[PDB]
Amino acid sequence: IRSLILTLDCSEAMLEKDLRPNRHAMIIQYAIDFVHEFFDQNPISQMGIIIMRNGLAQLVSQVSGNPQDHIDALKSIRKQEPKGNPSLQNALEMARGLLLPVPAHCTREVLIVFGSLSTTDPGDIHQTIDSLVSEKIRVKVLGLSAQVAICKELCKATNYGDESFYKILLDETHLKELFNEAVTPXXXXXXXXXXXXXXXXXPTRIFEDTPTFCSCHSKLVYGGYFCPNCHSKVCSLPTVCPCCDLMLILXXXXXXXXXXXXXXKTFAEVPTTEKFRSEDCFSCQSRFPXXXXXXXXXXXXXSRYRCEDCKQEFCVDCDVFIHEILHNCPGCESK
Amino acid sequence: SPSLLTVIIEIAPKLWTTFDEEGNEKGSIIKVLEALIVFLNAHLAFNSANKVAVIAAYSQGIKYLYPXXXXXXXXXXXXXXXXXXXXXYRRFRNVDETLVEEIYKLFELEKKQIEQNSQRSTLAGAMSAGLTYVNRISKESVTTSLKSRLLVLTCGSGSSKDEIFQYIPIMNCIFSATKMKCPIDVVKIGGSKESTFLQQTTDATNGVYLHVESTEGLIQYLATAMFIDPXXXXXXXXXXXXXXXXXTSCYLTGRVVAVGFICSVCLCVLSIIPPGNKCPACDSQFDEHVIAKLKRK
Amino acid sequence: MGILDEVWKHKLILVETPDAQETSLALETYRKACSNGRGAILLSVARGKVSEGIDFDHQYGRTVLMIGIPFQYTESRILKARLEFMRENYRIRENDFLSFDAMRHAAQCLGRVLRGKDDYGVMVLADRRFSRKRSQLPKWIAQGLSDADLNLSTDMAISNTKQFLRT
Amino acid sequence: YPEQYNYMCDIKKTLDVGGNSILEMPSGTGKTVSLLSLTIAYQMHYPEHRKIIYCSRTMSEIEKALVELENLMDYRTKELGYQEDFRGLGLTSRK
Ligand SMILES: [Zn+2]
Ligand SMILES: [Zn+2]
Ligand SMILES: [Zn+2]
Ligand SMILES: [Zn+2]
């Protein structure tokens, strides 16, 4: 569904001592964690890692849905020293070369981790910006410390003229938060066009391994997925079958679809003196006063959470928990 | 190591009717609750400091069969049971008292309006409240981690206990249960019928599925699951094989499908053959080029 | 010369004998250099030509550096003639010609930093004698330069954080 | 904005009473105030009485005063839809 291109800054400016021990190692590690979370909340999505080193853009992880390739590609960067200077234009041109074969019904995202305060580009970057906006490519830049006007014009131009995507990071925790923000999709207002895709297989799991089989690598396996079209037994991933080009999805597509469908209804905070109901939680059992800062003014007040779709009481930890995972409110299942 | 056991009981009068009609009386639900009581005492005697949690799911709503709920209601007495005279473990006999008292309350709640409210399945709320329960008590018992696993005694009866209105929240409960790393051991008490979404539950949460047709032996299945549940899984486990399904189903038509379409960045489920006029699941302009390529293939 | 070789790419110097086309090419070179993500140091004189006044953009110097305080060329017969003339007029001898003129020349550099409340900036004034004169928006803190490096390093992020928070 | 509005009131009362005023404007936010205050002050009396004699020190400020004066013309012609006798004569260098 999504096609994100992770462009990490790997130049001499990354050798400075801001993060611990340096910016490069923390960006690599947090990039590995970003690969984990991204492939955990986006199963049938694509990733591609490019680095900006030695004044050039170097593709280190081809566009694929297997996280292990990105993990190894990120492990190879921390064993070398980030030298040279960053090149935004070359990275955006190569990102274009990786996002052009992507179908129009799939989003094209480019996430740039920019630590330096200056880039080294051959040609005019504004023409590359015009090319990015023309072919519809959403660009998000996580810059370090001071702002760059080119990043403002790029993030604003690549998002329907709206500026709210050039995120400034000031610490490791902030960078973690931005990473987390790139996991979640962005249902923007769009420009109203047509959408649909067709042909998505569902596999049958083969447990046989006495003679083994493989139609994508011709190697030994312990069992493999079955294509309902070309009838090939390949390595197991819910992505595209490489023998006739169609998906092999299962309950994962339903999972991410329902995750994108979650309304996440925050329960209204109503004091016990206003609800006139005993302290109760419907997901567990709560006899704990929430408020008690003062004497009888706060202890006898407390806070009861309310789901209005069923008029039920809950405590805060369960509102947070059902906001993180699970469908909202067990009381909405009983009528 | 202390192990937590969240056993969910599907209380439905239709299950009582099916078990008291097909083949005379094959044993009422009270006997299954007594063998379940023996299983609970076995789990309590498995290791010290082991906690239990019995949750009920009545047709009119779910209600905790124990989790210190009656004690919390009385904080804001015996039923003259023979198991109380059996002595041994005061906590166990108190759990039995809470069970029989809550069951008697379920008897007091039953009427014709409850029969009119018997068209859904209150299992999603019990599974969500169960995962939230083990998470709340897991955070409260931070000292020495707990071996948390949830057993679902799915009572498949008549009316409409399995429908498309409950498949989505169950899938949310098995994805969230997968994130919680707590296996869901499903025991399908009922007739000779199997639900594909329950096979997705046991195969998705790395649990076990015990299909129980009619009644047969109780502590048989209760024991075969009982030795599996609290262990750290040193074996390869022995569930009921043949649970390989496509994990998807067309909602607009009602048939299991091999290939399909994405709705239209709506990402729903639909069949190949339907025309597609404004992605038939929601109103949004269908791509004329893609349908032009579809009608040819 | 590492500043020209690493961060500035090129330096902009106003000739002691200013030229119209040279200054125009230096200003256009400044706008294009700042519009390419490069930047350039503009070594100019407050007493020289072109006092500027066009800002309201990030193309202008976000940080402005002042070498001490402005000074007027003394040891001239004109400064002594007007010195004794104004001495006979308003009796402001040896006091206003080294603070009023320098105050105006420094204010010509202070006016380039201010360009609306939506924009930000920082102007570093050297010498303690600046405390003897007033300034636009009299809110100034006196500290070292090495500390001002980290202080500005934090201001370059606070100025970028408070924008969407105050909007 | 209220801060510039105070300078508008000061320009008004000094144009209606005083013969000369020393007004200190904040840098970067005081160029567009007097340009409209003078025009409105001319319209409240009668349309053609006193005229703007703006004096700058450079030509860039003259061009800025011209384009901002055009912003005044568009501003007064886009809010009322009525065309009036336009002003604005640019006296620049002879070359
Ligand atoms: Zn295939
Ligand atoms: Zn709770
Ligand atoms: Zn609710
Ligand atoms: Zn749709």
Swiss-Prot record, chain A:
Keyword Zinc-finger listed: yes
Compartmental location: Nucleus
Keywords of this entry: DNA damage, DNA repair, Metal-binding, Nucleus, Transcription, Transcription regulation, Zinc, Zinc-finger
One CC-aspect GO term: transcription factor TFIIH holo complex
Complex formation: Component of the 7-subunit TFIIH core complex composed of XPB/SSL2, XPD/RAD3, SSL1, TFB1, TFB2, TFB4 and TFB5, which is active in NER. The core complex associates with the 3-subunit CTD-kinase module TFIIK composed of CCL1, KIN28 and TFB3 to form the 10-subunit holoenzyme (holo-TFIIH) active in transcription. An additionnal subunit, TFB6, plays a role in the dissociation of the SSL2 helicase from TFIIH after transcription initiation.
Family: Belongs to the GTF2H2 family.
Summary of the function given for this chain in its UniProt record: Component of the general transcription and DNA repair factor IIH (TFIIH) core complex, which is involved in general and transcription-coupled nucleotide excision repair (NER) of damaged DNA and, when complexed to TFIIK, in RNA transcription by RNA polymerase II. In NER, TFIIH acts by opening DNA around the lesion to allow the excision of the damaged oligonucleotide and its replacement by a new DNA fragment. In transcription, TFIIH has an essential role in transcription initiation.
Note from the entry: Present with 2340 molecules/cell in log phase SD medium.
Protein name: General transcription and DNA repair factor IIH subunit SSL1
From Swiss-Prot, chain B:
GO aspect biological process, one term: regulation of DNA-templated transcription
Zinc finger (C4-type): 263-282
Keywords: Acetylation, DNA damage, DNA repair, Metal-binding, Nucleus, Transcription, Transcription regulation, Zinc, Zinc-finger
Superkingdom to which the source organism belongs: Eukaryota
Pfam families according to UniProt: Tfb4
Disulfide bonds listed in the record: none
Record-level GO cellular component terms: nucleotide-excision repair factor 3 complex; transcription factor TFIIH core complex; transcription factor TFIIH holo complex
Gene3D superfamilies named in the record: von Willebrand factor, type A domain
Name of this protein: General transcription and DNA repair factor IIH subunit TFB4
Swiss-Prot record, chain C:
Subcellular location per the Swiss-Prot or TrEMBL entry: Nucleus
Gene deletion effect: Essential, it cannot be deleted.
Subunit structure: Component of the 7-subunit TFIIH core complex composed of XPB/SSL2, XPD/RAD3, SSL1, TFB1, TFB2, TFB4 and TFB5, which is active in NER. The core complex associates with the 3-subunit CTD-kinase module TFIIK composed of CCL1, KIN28 and TFB3 to form the 10-subunit holoenzyme (holo-TFIIH) active in transcription. An additionnal subunit, TFB6, plays a role in the dissociation of the SSL2 helicase from TFIIH after transcription initiation.
Further information: Present with 14400 molecules/cell in log phase SD medium.
Family of the protein in this entry: Belongs to the helicase family. RAD3/XPD subfamily.
Function, in words: ATP-dependent 5'-3' DNA helicase. Component of the general transcription and DNA repair factor IIH (TFIIH) core complex, which is involved in general and transcription-coupled nucleotide excision repair (NER) of damaged DNA and, when complexed to TFIIK, in RNA transcription by RNA polymerase II. In NER, TFIIH acts by opening DNA around the lesion to allow the excision of the damaged oligonucleotide and its replacement by a new DNA fragment. The ATP-dependent helicase activity of XPD/RAD3 is required for DNA opening. In transcription, TFIIH has an essential role in transcription initiation.
Source species of the chain: Saccharomyces cerevisiae (strain ATCC 204508 / S288c) (Baker's yeast)
Curated annotation (Swiss-Prot), chain D:
Binding residue positions for ATP: 25-32
Mutagenesis / variant outcome for changing residue 31 to R/A: Loss of ATPase and DNA helicase activities but not ssDNA-binding or ATP-binding, impaired removal of pyrimidine dimers. Loss of RNA:DNA helicase. Extremely UV-sensitive
Free-text disruption phenotype from the record: Essential, it cannot be deleted.
Localization annotation: Nucleus
The organism's place on the tree of life at top rank: Eukaryota
Function description: ATP-dependent 5'-3' DNA helicase. Component of the general transcription and DNA repair factor IIH (TFIIH) core complex, which is involved in general and transcription-coupled nucleotide excision repair (NER) of damaged DNA and, when complexed to TFIIK, in RNA transcription by RNA polymerase II. In NER, TFIIH acts by opening DNA around the lesion to allow the excision of the damaged oligonucleotide and its replacement by a new DNA fragment. The ATP-dependent helicase activity of XPD/RAD3 is required for DNA opening. In transcription, TFIIH has an essential role in transcription initiation.
Membership in a protein family: Belongs to the helicase family. RAD3/XPD subfamily.
Any further remark recorded for this protein: Present with 14400 molecules/cell in log phase SD medium.
Protein name: General transcription and DNA repair factor IIH helicase subunit XPD/RAD3
UniProt organism field: Saccharomyces cerevisiae (strain ATCC 204508 / S288c) (Baker's yeast)
Lineage: Eukaryota, Fungi, Dikarya, Ascomycota, Saccharomycotina
Residues of the full protein shown: 18 to 112 of 778
